[PDB]
Amino acid sequence: TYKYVNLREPSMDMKSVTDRAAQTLLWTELIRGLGMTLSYLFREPATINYPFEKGPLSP
Amino acid sequence: MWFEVLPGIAVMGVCLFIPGMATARIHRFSNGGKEKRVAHYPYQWYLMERDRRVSGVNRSYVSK
Amino acid sequence: NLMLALLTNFTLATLLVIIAFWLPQLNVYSEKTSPYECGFDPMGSARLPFSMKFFLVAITFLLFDLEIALLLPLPWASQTANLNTMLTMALFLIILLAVSLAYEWTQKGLE
Amino acid sequence: MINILMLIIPILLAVAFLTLVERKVLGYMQLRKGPNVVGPYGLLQPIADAIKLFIKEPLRPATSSASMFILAPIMALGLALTMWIPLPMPYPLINMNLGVLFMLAMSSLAVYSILWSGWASNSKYALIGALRAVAQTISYEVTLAIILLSVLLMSGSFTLSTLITTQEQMWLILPAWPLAMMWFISTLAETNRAPFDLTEGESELVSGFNVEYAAGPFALFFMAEYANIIMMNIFTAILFLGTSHNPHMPELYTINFTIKSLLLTMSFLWIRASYPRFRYDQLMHLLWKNFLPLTLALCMWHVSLPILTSGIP
Amino acid sequence: EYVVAKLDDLINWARRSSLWPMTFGLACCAVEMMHMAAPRYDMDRFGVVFRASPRQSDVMIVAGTLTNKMAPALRKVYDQMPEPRYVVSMGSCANGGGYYHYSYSVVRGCDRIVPVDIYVPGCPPTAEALLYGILQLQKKIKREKRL
Amino acid sequence: MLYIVFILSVIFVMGFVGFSSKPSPIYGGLGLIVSGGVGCGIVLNFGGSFLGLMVFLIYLGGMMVVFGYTTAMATEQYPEIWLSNKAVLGAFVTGLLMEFFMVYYVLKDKEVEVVFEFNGLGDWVIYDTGDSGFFSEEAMGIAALYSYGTWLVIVTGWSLLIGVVVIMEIT
Amino acid sequence: AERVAAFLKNVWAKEPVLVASFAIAGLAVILPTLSPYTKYSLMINXXXXXXXXXXXXXXXXXXXXXXXXXXXXXXXXXXX
Amino acid sequence: SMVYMNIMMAFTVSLVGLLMYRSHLMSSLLCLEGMMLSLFVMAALTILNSHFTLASMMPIILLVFAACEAALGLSLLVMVSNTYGTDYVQNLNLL
Numbered sequence A: 001t002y003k004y005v006n007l008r009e010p011s012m013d014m015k016s017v018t019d020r021a022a023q024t025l026l027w028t029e030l031i032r033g034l035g036m037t038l039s040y041l042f043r044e045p046a047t048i049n050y051p052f053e054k055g056p057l058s059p
Numbered sequence B: 001m002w003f004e005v006l007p008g009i010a011v012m013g014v015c016l017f018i019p020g021m022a023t024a025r026i027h028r029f030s031n032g033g034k035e036k037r038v039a040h041y042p043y044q045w046y047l048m049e050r051d052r053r054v055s056g057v058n059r060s061y062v063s064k
Numbered sequence C: 001n002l003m004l005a006l007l008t009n010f011t012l013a014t015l016l017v018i019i020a021f022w023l024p025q026l027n028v029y030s031e032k033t034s035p036y037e038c039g040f041d042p043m044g045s046a047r048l049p050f051s052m053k054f055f056l057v058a059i060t061f062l063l064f065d066l067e068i069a070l071l072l073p074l075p076w077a078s079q080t081a082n083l084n085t086m087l088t089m090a091l092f093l094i095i096l097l098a099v100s101l102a103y104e105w106t107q108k109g110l111e
Numbered sequence D: 001m002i003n004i005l006m007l008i009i010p011i012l013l014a015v016a017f018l019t020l021v022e023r024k025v026l027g028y029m030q031l032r033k034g035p036n037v038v039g040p041y042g043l044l045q046p047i048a049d050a051i052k053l054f055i056k057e058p059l060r061p062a063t064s065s066a067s068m069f070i071l072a073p074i075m076a077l078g079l080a081l082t083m084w085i086p087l088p089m090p091y092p093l094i095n096m097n098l099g100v101l102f103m104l105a106m107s108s109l110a111v112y113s114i115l116w117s118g119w120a121s122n123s124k125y126a127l128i129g130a131l132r133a134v135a136q137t138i139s140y141e142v143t144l145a146i147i148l149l150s151v152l153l154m155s156g157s158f159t160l161s162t163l164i165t166t167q168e169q170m171w172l173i174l175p176a177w178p179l180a181m182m183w184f185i186s187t188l189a190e191t192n193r194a195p196f197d198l199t200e201g202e203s204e205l206v207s208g209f210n211v212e213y214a215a216g217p218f219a220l221f222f223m224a225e226y227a228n229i230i231m232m233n234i235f236t237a238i239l240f241l242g243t244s245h246n247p248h249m250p251e252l253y254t255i256n257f258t259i260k261s262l263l264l265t266m267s268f269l270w271i272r273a274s275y276p277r278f279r280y281d282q283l284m285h286l287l288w289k290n291f292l293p294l295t296l297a298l299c300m301w302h303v304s305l306p307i308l309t310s311g312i313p
Numbered sequence E: 001e002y003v004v005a006k007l008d009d010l011i012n013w014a015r016r017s018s019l020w021p022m023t024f025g026l027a028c029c030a031v032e033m034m035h036m037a038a039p040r041y042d043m044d045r046f047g048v049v050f051r052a053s054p055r056q057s058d059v060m061i062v063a064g065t066l067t068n069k070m071a072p073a074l075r076k077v078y079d080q081m082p083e084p085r086y087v088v089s090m091g092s093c094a095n096g097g098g099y100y101h102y103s104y105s106v107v108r109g110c111d112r113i114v115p116v117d118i119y120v121p122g123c124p125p126t127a128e129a130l131l132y133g134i135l136q137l138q139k140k141i142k143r144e145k146r147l
Numbered sequence F: 001m002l003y004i005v006f007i008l009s010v011i012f013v014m015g016f017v018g019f020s021s022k023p024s025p026i027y028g029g030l031g032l033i034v035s036g037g038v039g040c041g042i043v044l045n046f047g048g049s050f051l052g053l054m055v056f057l058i059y060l061g062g063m064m065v066v067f068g069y070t071t072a073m074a075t076e077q078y079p080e081i082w083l084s085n086k087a088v089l090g091a092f093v094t095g096l097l098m099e100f101f102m103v104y105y106v107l108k109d110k111e112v113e114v115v116f117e118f119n120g121l122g123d124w125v126i127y128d129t130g131d132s133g134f135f136s137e138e139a140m141g142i143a144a145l146y147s148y149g150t151w152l153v154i155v156t157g158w159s160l161l162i163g164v165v166v167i168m169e170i171t
Numbered sequence G: 001a002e003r004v005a006a007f008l009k010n011v012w013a014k015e016p017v018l019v020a021s022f023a024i025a026g027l028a029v030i031l032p033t034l035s036p037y038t039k040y041s042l043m044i045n046x047x048x049x050x051x052x053x054x055x056x057x058x059x060x061x062x063x064x065x066x067x068x069x070x071x072x073x074x075x076x077x078x079x080x
Numbered sequence H: 001s002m003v004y005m006n007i008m009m010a011f012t013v014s015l016v017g018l019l020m021y022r023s024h025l026m027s028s029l030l031c032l033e034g035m036m037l038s039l040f041v042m043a044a045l046t047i048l049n050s051h052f053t054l055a056s057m058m059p060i061i062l063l064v065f066a067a068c069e070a071a072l073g074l075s076l077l078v079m080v081s082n083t084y085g086t087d088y089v090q091n092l093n094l095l
């Protein structure tokens, strides 16, 4: 079917080059990656402590 | 939940809070006026030496 | 006192080692091994040179560290001396360091 | 002297209570419950490790070395805990003639803890973790002094007492905009719990300064390695943060200074969980090849600024 | 008399509090041993912190099949452990071969190489059943040093 | 108790014996930290915190480069302890007699010296400097300067350019 | 354009940090020579006294008075 | 005078250290930085006691050049091991 992993260079001229250069000069996308686990901290953990709570099973 | 996270921060708000207050509040017993003099260069050092010499006698820093 | 401040921290640190040294004792068998971490007998016994790979980049640090030490006057010296005479000389050391790193770009090494 | 003893025992507790945060904040970052069983919120577990690792754990290395090895955990604590002394705080313990020079010298001397642990085991397996720890620290000592010099020339002299007074209206983050971003990376020069980090954590290679050490020396290493993380967090909160001074009321400063540092204390453990290791070769290419020409260009920029507009202490 | 008896329990409370496991990537049991780190069934800072290195850890969990090629390897790792050490053989392979047992390469039951204190019988060792392997360990530590 | 610098100078020579009496660049490497770090205290007690802590900045950093060749190149065969070898320990035992036997003559009267100058006691004379300057104090207080010695800035900048290019030709 | 605009965008595409290393360091040399504010900073640097004042013997001298507030020599009044 | 005699005695031991060679070549490069360390302490005490201010810049220049030779000699140590195996004073061909 072919999905293709290669993007064949997203940058071309002026507008497409400068924004791709801005993320490599400072960070931006790493701060975007930093914010990915920020929301993960905010949501409740799906944790079960054994001596009191028990896990799901089958008949 | 943050009700589990906040006691981990509150325990740090006591232990790390100590070195700031322990340095400042000890100046009451060590010196008369809750202040330790800054040395840097001999000019400020000489002012402390003549203070201890002039009628303070035993005390390093004392008013009048 | 600086001497009394440094020694009290150092003596308390070494005393904590003694607590962990004398209290736990029961048996010491021929059980401890040379490499550890992953297991098995050490194929590389004692010591062997290895070396290389970072030999050029490490040497350049010893050369560069002297210049940064010579850059340390900047915030502390520029108070009494004339600024216009200093401007030509203060930048001069920083410019030439970029020139040496420009020569470092043409084949950096194995690293 | 009472102040030094009131800056080791409560400080070792801060490195002890760090172990909570090291798996509570890091836990919620990974969506998992950390300390819970031992105490009310696992608060009795950090103090339990001191009973666990020292009193009962006995190891000494096999082939070993002579006096060195056990000299290294003494070098670990006795050079990293001394770093607390030159700190300006509200009031410093023996205010140095030049402040930051003692901070930069003893930090490089603290690197020796992981260096002497290479000769802890005579076997070659341990020294690979030491040789990797050389380059992951040796290169980053260059910029650490340069980025300091650009900030120091902007505000005051080397004295740490003047760095508090210089920030009366606004922080030093805004004038030193690219330089503040550098001190999230350059602070991780020492072997710290991070993504950039050094040869200390497991992941790919064997644990540096831990595979040779026991429990008792190895336990003493963590009380020094995690101590440096707080030290860099406070040091960033002096050079880049400030907000207010107030010499009359020390109470208003002590609360406000801790919140600024604690936000940075979370930020390094935020870095640790989020990103993979940068590799031995490619960390040497982040700096030196890419970041060193950037920092020197800003160093060139910060030389001209006091001459362009009056800025001399 | 009473202070001496309670101090021994205080030292034993430290092992009741926290024990660091070893990441023995030995078989399929090691995958369920990774499920102890997985949030749904967690011992992460409940009493277990993964760090590896046999020199630092207190408890080693033999997670799967051992062979004659592995018998000299695991033995000295147990010797590299600090003297207060506990071995939890988890799985049927760790108890005497899942199938195997009558095979040529597999060493039977780990006890031929290294002594075991707590046994876990489960092939696919369910994380629910695995939690006993650490909780019963803490319960078994009762008394040390009378004189 | 009156002596501050004199006790530190004993520790200074103590580390220097582990150089003539060769203990390998790891035990001999320690000397640059032990006697080097105490050697900063000799500079610091006389005055000038800048130049005193300047020794710490290079002789520890540059020693890491030396450490990058202790576990490399040549020395990785045997540790070679200065307490084991008969040829090494013989130089150390005669090395300590060059230092510890000299201190024996310091106590009571002036010490005997190979040089013409007498050592004497000198406790208060150890500083040998008056207060004099107050504002912008110490000769070391404004030590490093780009002005006056403008010619010295150029050649130091040249010598740190030469090395980088030269080492590239060698390797 | 041959190298002014054509070659500048090539530095932005591959290794973009090289642009900032030349531009920021380049402006650090040009600005202190052309801007009309640099001469003011040297004036205050010379005005600030490090050492104590020296008294000279007066015998027919212009622009010299007592230590009291009076118009003598010059005295700095550059911006408050 | 008094303090100078101890650091001069440290110089003489490091002087012998540069003239003594055993097995490895690494001892010389330690003693090269060692002898420069002893000269630096001697320079620091002489200039500061009888104050100079202008000539206190001179040991800072000396400290820069202290490792200038040491960095080049340590880089020469690298190429000897590449030609041979391990750097040895005992192993030489030229007459």
Ligand SMILES: NC(=O)c1ccc[n+]([C@@H]2O[C@H](COP(=O)([O-])OP(=O)(O)OC[C@H]3O[C@@H](n4cnc5c(N)ncnc54)[C@H](OP(=O)(O)O)[C@@H]3O)[C@@H](O)[C@H]2O)c1
Binding pocket: none
């Ligand atoms: N020096 C020699 O090698 C040598 C020379 C000639 C003959 N031998 C003979 O060979 C034998 C060697 O044995 P060993 O000395 O190796 O044994 P051991 O190490 O003393 O071990 C004996 C064990 O029995 C327990 N035990 C003994 N008496 C006890 C009491 N009254 N109450 C409670 N527990 C007690 C101890 O437990 P706890 O530690 O828990 O109390 C100990 O673990 C000796 O019996 C001796 O006659 C030895």
Ligand code: SF4
Binding pocket: E027, E028, E029, E030, E063, E064, E065, E090, E091, E092, E093, E094, E098, E122, E123, E124, E125
């Ligand atoms: S006991 Fe079962 S799950 Fe465990 S290693 Fe053996 S076959 Fe795999």
